[PDB]
Design a binder for this molecule. Structure first.
Ligand SMILES: [Cl-]
Length: 207
């Protein structure tokens, strides 16, 4: 499966791609404003995620730090990134179908469109100005808008017991981006695509 990752933001992002215990493709790369990076993701990849990282520095060896989405200080991510990170999430070739979503469960940093480039399903988008409108208590000083679980570490926000409801904080994310997951037990906004579809993740899809 191919994912074209496109940075339409006016600022540089460092794209990242991981399934939590391994990189997808090279795992990460710099994308200046306007750049595209096409990656190959192995069929059957379950629980894959793509995200943007902002304000990164890396040495010649690919070690450093990012202000949002840092993955253990690596340019080439092997693990998931530090919140806040808008997430493009996907599981591929699951009994003949692909499943895609956008999630704000680990906060929001950069707006995103996540769309198939092949036939048979729709895309999803979270392009509202979540950082600008972020509730005071969720604003990350390093940049971005944290989820409430990251900030407050309660069973209700983290849905630790498997029982949780929507919250004032989850409703904020849901208000701004109805088509993205706002908390663990949100009514799903997962799209079912044909098995072996291809995709494009666009950062800052709209002005
Ligand atoms: Cl900020």
């Amino acid at each position: 499966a191919t994912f074209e990752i496109v940075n339409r933001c006016s600022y540089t992002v460092w794209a990242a791609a991981s399934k939590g215990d391994a990189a997808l493709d090279a795992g990460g790369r710099q994308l200046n404003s306007g750049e595209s990076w096409t990656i190959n993701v192995e069929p059957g990849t379950n629980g894959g995620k793509i995200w943007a990282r902002t304000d990164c520095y890396f040495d010649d060896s690919g070690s450093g730090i990012c202000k949002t989405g840092d993955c253990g200080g690596l340019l080439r991510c092997k693990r998931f990134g530090r919140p806040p990170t808008t997430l493009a999430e996907f599981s591929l070739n699951q009994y003949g179908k692909d499943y895609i979503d956008i999630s704000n469960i680990k906060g929001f940093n950069v707006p995103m469109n996540f769309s198939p480039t092949t036939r048979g399903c729709r895309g999803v988008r979270c392009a509202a100005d979540i950082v600008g409108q972020c509730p005071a208590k969720l604003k990350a000083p390093g940049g971005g808008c944290n989820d409430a679980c990251t900030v407050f570490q309660t069973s209700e926000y983290c849905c630790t017991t498997g029982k949780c409801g929507p919250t004032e904080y989850s409703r904020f994310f849901k208000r701004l981006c109805p088509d993205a997951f706002s908390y663990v037990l949100d009514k799903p906004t997962t799209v079912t695509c044909p098995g072996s579809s291809n995709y494009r993740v666009t950062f800052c899809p709209t002005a």
